[PDB]
Design an enzyme around this catalytic site. Structure first.
Site, PDB file in Angstrom:
ATOM      1  N   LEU A 135       0.858  -1.064   0.029  1.00  0.00           N
ATOM      2  CA  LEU A 135      -0.143  -0.035  -0.158  1.00  0.00           C
ATOM      3  C   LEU A 135       0.860   1.395   0.062  1.00  0.00           C
ATOM      4  O   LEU A 135       0.661   2.105  -0.987  1.00  0.00           O
ATOM      5  CB  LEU A 135      -0.833   0.074   1.291  1.00  0.00           C
ATOM      6  CG  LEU A 135      -1.866  -0.791   1.125  1.00  0.00           C
ATOM      7  CD1 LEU A 135      -1.721  -2.375   1.717  1.00  0.00           C
ATOM      8  CD2 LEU A 135      -3.258  -0.633   1.974  1.00  0.00           C
ATOM      9  N   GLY A 136       1.798   1.241   0.921  1.00  0.00           N
ATOM     10  CA  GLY A 136       2.707   2.496   0.983  1.00  0.00           C
ATOM     11  C   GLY A 136       2.055   3.819   1.278  1.00  0.00           C
ATOM     12  O   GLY A 136       2.982   4.625   1.863  1.00  0.00           O
ATOM     13  N   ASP A 137       0.956   3.861   1.547  1.00  0.00           N
ATOM     14  CA  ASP A 137       0.278   5.100   2.182  1.00  0.00           C
ATOM     15  C   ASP A 137      -0.690   4.848   3.185  1.00  0.00           C
ATOM     16  O   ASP A 137      -1.787   5.501   3.245  1.00  0.00           O
ATOM     17  CB  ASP A 137      -0.478   5.683   0.877  1.00  0.00           C
ATOM     18  CG  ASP A 137      -1.585   4.968   0.453  1.00  0.00           C
ATOM     19  OD1 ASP A 137      -1.417   3.642   0.567  1.00  0.00           O
ATOM     20  OD2 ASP A 137      -2.576   5.374  -0.202  1.00  0.00           O
ATOM     21  N   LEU A 138      -0.448   3.942   4.116  1.00  0.00           N
ATOM     22  CA  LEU A 138      -1.484   3.422   5.189  1.00  0.00           C
ATOM     23  C   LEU A 138      -1.595   4.389   6.207  1.00  0.00           C
ATOM     24  O   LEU A 138      -0.488   4.860   6.776  1.00  0.00           O
ATOM     25  CB  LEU A 138      -1.006   2.114   5.793  1.00  0.00           C
ATOM     26  CG  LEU A 138      -1.257   0.819   5.305  1.00  0.00           C
ATOM     27  CD1 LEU A 138      -0.748  -0.354   5.870  1.00  0.00           C
ATOM     28  CD2 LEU A 138      -2.929   0.521   5.460  1.00  0.00           C
TER      29      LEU A 138
ATOM     30  N   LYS B 228      -6.810   6.248   5.333  1.00  0.00           N
ATOM     31  CA  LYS B 228      -7.081   5.346   4.331  1.00  0.00           C
ATOM     32  C   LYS B 228      -8.466   4.296   4.677  1.00  0.00           C
ATOM     33  O   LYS B 228      -8.670   3.433   3.676  1.00  0.00           O
ATOM     34  CB  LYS B 228      -5.686   4.616   4.158  1.00  0.00           C
ATOM     35  CG  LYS B 228      -5.497   3.516   3.080  1.00  0.00           C
ATOM     36  CD  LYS B 228      -5.455   4.462   1.524  1.00  0.00           C
ATOM     37  CE  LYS B 228      -4.966   3.416   0.534  1.00  0.00           C
ATOM     38  NZ  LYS B 228      -4.846   3.926  -0.877  1.00  0.00           N
TER      39      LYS B 228
END
Length: 252
Positions: free
Chosen positions: A114-117, A121
């Site tokens: 995901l990298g953007d948790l 989100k």
């Protein structure tokens, strides 16, 4: 006037690439966001094609060059929810965090980082606000505004190259702490102090947090990425027990 398959598209108050989608037959109201298909295939489609709906996507209409993704209205995000509750009791925190973790485990098991948790989100699927879904359409809690609270030790040390999956798990740790405490574990407004505390893994878990919750947090916020639990392993952690196809249509 904007019509796509059997939906009418209407401008939304914000209008990023998101619109109101009204079913012509019944007046059923969804949301629609348009993407270039290449971008849809690379970044959105993987989330749809997992075995198990962790998103709230109803269907995707594939035009010439663009993908029209129809999704359900949500009932708010977990950042706003924590803010309004201040912090969650362990039983609620555990129910909701297990949904969050199950989503991420599913992703990781199909090689999706995901990298953007973050808490924002995740959004509620119903007005009950008991069931969360992943916000997958690219669509208060610190000392001051703009705390980079999801900065991991890897991104400060190493040389840019690190494990995507293990970095997501750090983010799950930040989220868990924040659900229970109502502040981020690393929350200095001075970035020098913040970065020093993150690199050295220095944070404090309040005394009253249960022993199972405290060691779970600690098992996620390990400085060394290889020492953290995997997302699958989190689901079997004793804390939880202690307190507890999307169709794609072509069009012209």
């Amino acid at each position: 006037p904007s019509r796509i398959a059997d939906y009418l598209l209407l401008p939304l108050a914000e209008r990023e690439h998101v619109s109101r989608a009204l079913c012509i037959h019944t007046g059923r109201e969804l949301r629609c966001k348009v993407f270039p298909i290449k971008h849809y295939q690379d970044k959105i489609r993987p989330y749809i094609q997992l075995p198990s709906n962790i998103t709230g996507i109803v269907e995707v209409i594939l035009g010439e060059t663009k993908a029209y993704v129809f999704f359900e209205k949500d009932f708010g995000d977990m950042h706003s929810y924590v803010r309004s509750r201040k912090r969650l009791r362990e039983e609620e925190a555990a129910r909701l965090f297990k949904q969050i973790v199950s989503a991420v485990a599913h992703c990781h098991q199909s090689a999706i980082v995901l990298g953007d948790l973050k808490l924002r989100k995740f959004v509620f699927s119903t007005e009950e606000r008991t069931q969360l879904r992943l916000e997958s359409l690219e669509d208060a809690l610190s000392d001051k505004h703009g705390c980079p609270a999801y900065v991991s030790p890897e991104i400060l040390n190493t040389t840019g190259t690190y494990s995507g999956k293990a970095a997501d798990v750090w983010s799950l740790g930040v989220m868990l702490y924040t659900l229970l405490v109502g502040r981020y574990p690393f929350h200095d407004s001075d970035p020098s102090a913040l970065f020093s505390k993150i690199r050295r893994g220095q944070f404090c878990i309040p005394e009253h947090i249960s022993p199972k919750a405290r060691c779970l947090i600690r098992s996620l916020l390990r400085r060394e990425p290889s020492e953290r639990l995997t997302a699958p392993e989190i689901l079997l952690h004793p804390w939880f027990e202690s307190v507890l196809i999307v169709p794609e249509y072509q069009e012209d």
